Design a protein around this ligand. Structure first.
Ligand SMILES: [Mg+2]
Ligand SMILES: [Mg+2]
Ligand SMILES: [Mg+2]
Ligand SMILES: [Mg+2]
Ligand SMILES: [Mg+2]
Ligand SMILES: [Mg+2]
Ligand SMILES: [Mg+2]
Ligand SMILES: [Mg+2]
Ligand SMILES: [Mg+2]
Ligand SMILES: [Mg+2]
Ligand SMILES: [Mg+2]
Ligand SMILES: [Mg+2]
Ligand SMILES: [Mg+2]
Ligand SMILES: [Mg+2]
Ligand SMILES: [Mg+2]
Ligand SMILES: [Mg+2]
Ligand SMILES: [Mg+2]
Lengths: 64, 65, 149, 135, 214
RNA sequence: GUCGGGCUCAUAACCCGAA
RNA sequence: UGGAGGUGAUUUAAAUG
RNA sequence: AGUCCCUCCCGCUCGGGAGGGAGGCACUCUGGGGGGACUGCCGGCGAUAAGCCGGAGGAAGGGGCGGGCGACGGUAGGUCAGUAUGCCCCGAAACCCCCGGGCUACACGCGCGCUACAAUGGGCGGGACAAUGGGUGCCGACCCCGAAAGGGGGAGGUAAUCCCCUAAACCCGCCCUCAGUUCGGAUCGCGGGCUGCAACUCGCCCGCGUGAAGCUGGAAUCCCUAGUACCCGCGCGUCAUCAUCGCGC
């Protein structure tokens, strides 16, 4: 089961609110943004966070 | 003497003592009741679009939960 | 045409037949009575097995020289049935190989590189490659794909 | 004078092939491909050449050096190297599309390797175990 | 013995083993047609890449399926014609080259004996050996009973191939007949509905038991 | 009935082989 | 949400410490 | 690999091969750093959540695959015969050394395996292709001697340099043709070696001879889902010598 982890969601929600006009629906752009805006050291964790932020952007833009 | 072919159109569920049987809905392709839809019990892997050769077309399997 | 262009077993057969004309190749006096190694069970069934072994050794020197006794002993070893115990690999003996190499040197086909082993002479290379050319000529009558090579 | 090099791998066997304009001669470790034995190994190497056709086959020469693995691993690695060399040399997409349909592994390879062995009858394999008794 | 033209055989077309085409081969049974793969192919050796995926075996050429079926011992944990046949160190487990040669020699014998394309005869045999009705087991009062059911086409194909292989295995066990001759004999007998064939008799017995348990 | 082996955590019942 | 009643049924054998 | 020179072979050289040297880091490989996969994209089910099912593209697709790491406790589970330690005992013996025996006995019940009961083979000659590891109290190429096991000299190696190291199953040709046999190789006689201070009790190897049961296995019962199971050999541990074992390839 691919159940998202708790701390990933917490940090992605924190990142999304602080910079609403910084994340788009592009995975590569969000990957670079997560790389620049935190001290995350694992490549796997960075990808997980970026993917969840992408989903958040398209969920709020769609209006839920 | 040569059976009647029937086409599987829907999968219902697994049954049997050890789960080895699948119940399906089939449509008769040839013979007296050509066009009739009946449900049957099958041994072995099966998917939508398969064809069975029934040796008789008057027995229908009991509906399962 | 060279040794590389023909099947090995057919070439060994032809070379063994041609080796019976060289007066320096003669089976030792104990040849009728011995096995070719501790992993065999019965004696050789061909009355002219010495010439086959000599031809095989010459082709081996051609392809892998310089080479010495111990490595050839590895090459001619094999699997052994050990009764109720599991089968195992064993090396061959040395007398047959050493005598064959000495006879081949007596015929001028091989020579000794000091501390390194034995190598094929230009005479031995010509001897092998001529027979290989003859076999390849016969061979491409029935396999036309071998004319391009 | 074109020279093109390609590489192929299959379970610890490694093959390096070189291709240039020629007359149709294909050698494996110095031996003509027409004399490779057994037959099952020979047909493994020859499939891409037969797929390409007689025109392309007779217009090139191919030399292959292969080491490691076994007699079936070495045949498949050489097959991969030859197919890659043929697609790169002639540079046409009908032939490449023909390879993917017949056998995708010809161009994408095979990543499988042996699984390391584990205790409880380690010498036999990772999963096979000793017979169990209760009395 | 074997001529040098056959020892070094070079094919130039894509056909089964470089010797037989399957262009005129027809499959009469409508249920087995999508599962008997006949697409043109020279070497029937796919290196076991089909078993991972569900329904993957459908797109495997029928000759390779046969070769895989005979690469076995035969009688390990059930008896065939009244005997276990445990061959162990002299079995064909994992020896695909020997099984390939067995199938090739059997095909040559079949073609010589009947005058027809061997693939067609094999197709006829598997059609005659594939059962249409089987049974499943129930337990009541400490007594085991049968209940009749239908069979899916993939299982029909698998069972027919298995029984052809087992019949060939039994015909050569501790007798002067060879494995290739036994396989050719079993295929030919099954193609003609002779009760001397193991697979066809097995097929008749299964259908009779299923019929008498409706 | 005797002896031996299965099944059970074990014994009885039960199954198999033998003289 | 939680309760009180009624009518039907229950697929072999299975002792002991 | 392409390029230059030298030497030797072939169908006598238009062409095709093999060594050596100059030269190069292309290719393979070695090992530091980095990229790549996120249910990210598409269509359904579910609630419009959590997720699930099916497609593309892709070396790789849904913990990508194989491993290490085992919570609070229990099990009076095993170990004081690895080492540590309380109490009780021996303390001129229950402590310390030396010699010879024993742990290797043999009407019999049981576990786990090896070799077979043959043609999905046995024998004889010929032809192919590995990886893991290890080496100075050592690995030993190469030459000579011997039918074999073995013996006498001995280059290089403190090791990507030298050595163990030219695996077997597989392929070609000939003999045997369903038989207790050219199946099987237990058991025993005579002779030859190695290690060691010592080979009877009680070691391993080789030559000739000898030739037991076994012709597929009752009731029961074990392992395994992919480079997995089956089949085949090999390395290391133990080790002076000795592998039907363990751990790995
Ligand atoms: Mg050999
Ligand atoms: Mg044997
Ligand atoms: Mg064995
Ligand atoms: Mg393994
Ligand atoms: Mg009892
Ligand atoms: Mg994991
Ligand atoms: Mg206790
Ligand atoms: Mg206990
Ligand atoms: Mg003991
Ligand atoms: Mg014997
Ligand atoms: Mg042999
Ligand atoms: Mg005998
Ligand atoms: Mg004695
Ligand atoms: Mg003794
Ligand atoms: Mg007897
Ligand atoms: Mg017999
Ligand atoms: Mg032990």
């Amino acid at each position: 089961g691919k159940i998202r982890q708790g701390f990933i969601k917490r940090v992605a929600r924190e990142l999304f609110n602080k910079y609403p006009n910084e994340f788009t629906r592009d995975f590569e752009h969000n990957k670079k943004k997560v790389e620049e805006l935190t001290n995350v050291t694992s490549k796997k964790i960075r990808n997980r966070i970026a993917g969840y932020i992408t989903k958040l952007v398209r969920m709020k833009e769609e209006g839920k | 003497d040569e059976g009647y072919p029937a086409e599987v159109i829907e999968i219902i569920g697994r049954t049997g003592t050890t789960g080895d049987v699948t119940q399906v809905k089939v449509r008769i392709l040839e013979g007296r009741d050509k066009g009739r839809v009946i449900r049957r019990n099958v041994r072995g892997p099966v998917r939508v679009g398969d064809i069975l050769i029934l040796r008789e077309t008057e027995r229908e399997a009991r509906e399962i939960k | 045409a060279t040794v590389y262009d023909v099947p090995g077993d057919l070439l060994v057969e032809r070379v063994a037949q041609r080796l019976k004309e060289i007066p320096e190749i003669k089976p030792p006096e104990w040849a009728p009575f011995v096995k070719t190694g501790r992993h065999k069970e019965r004696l050789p069934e061909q009355e002219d097995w010495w010439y086959y072994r000599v031809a095989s050794i010459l082709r081996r020197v051609y392809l892998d020289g310089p080479v010495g006794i111990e490595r050839l002993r590895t090459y001619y070893g094999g699997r052994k049935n050990r009764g109720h115990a599991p089968e195992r690999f064993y090396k061959a003996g040395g007398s047959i190989i050493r005598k064959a190499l000495q006879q081949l040197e007596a015929a001028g086909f091989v020579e000794k590189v000091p501390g390194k082993g034995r190598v094929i002479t230009p005479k031995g290379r010509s001897f092998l490659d001529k027979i290989a050319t003859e076999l390849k000529k016969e061979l491409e009558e029935i396999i036309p794909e071998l004319k391009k090579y | 004078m074109r020279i093109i090099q390609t590489t192929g791998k299959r379970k610890t066997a490694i093959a390096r092939a070189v291709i240039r304009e020629g007359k149709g001669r294909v050698r494996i470790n110095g031996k003509p491909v027409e004399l490779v034995e057994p037959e099952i190994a020979r047909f493994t190497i020859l499939e891409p050449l037969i797929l390409a056709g007689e025109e392309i086959w007779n217009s090139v020469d191919i030399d292959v050096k292969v080491q490691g693995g076994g007699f079936m691993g070495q045949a498949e690695a050489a097959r991969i190297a030859i197919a890659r060399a043929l697609v790169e040399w002639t540079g046409d997409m009908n032939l490449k599309e023909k390879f993917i349909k017949y056998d995708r592994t010809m161009l994408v390879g095979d990543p499988r390797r042996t699984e390391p062995h584990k205790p409880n009858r380690s010498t036999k394999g990772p999963r096979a175990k000793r017979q169990k008794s209760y009395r | 013995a074997k001529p040098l033209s056959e020892r070094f055989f070079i094919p130039h077309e894509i056909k089964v083993m470089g010797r037989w085409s399957t262009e005129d081969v027809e499959v009469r049974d409508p249920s087995l047609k999508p599962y008997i793969n006949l697409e043109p192919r020279l070497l029937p050796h796919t290196h076991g890449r089909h078993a991972k995926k569900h329904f993957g075996k459908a797109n495997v050429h029928i000759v390779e399926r046969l070769i895989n079926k005979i690469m076995r011992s035969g009688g390990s944990h059930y008896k065939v014609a009244g005997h276990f046949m445990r061959r162990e160190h002299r079995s064909l487990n994992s020896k695909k080259v020997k099984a390939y040669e067995v199938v090739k020699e059997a095909f040559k014998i079949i073609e010589k004996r009947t005058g027809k394309n061997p693939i067609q005869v094999l197709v006829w045999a598997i059609e005659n050996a594939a059962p249409r009705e089987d049974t499943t087991s129930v337990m009541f009062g400490g007594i085991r009973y049968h209940v009749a059911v239908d069979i899916s086409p993939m299982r029909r194909l698998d069972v027919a191939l298995r029984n052809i292989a087992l019949g060939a295995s039994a015909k050569c066990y501790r007798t002067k007949m060879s494995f290739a001759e036994a396989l050719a004999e079993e295929i030919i007998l099954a193609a003609n509905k002779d009760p001397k064939s193991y697979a066809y008799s097995k097929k008749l017995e299964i259908e009779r038991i299923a019929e008498s348990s409706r």
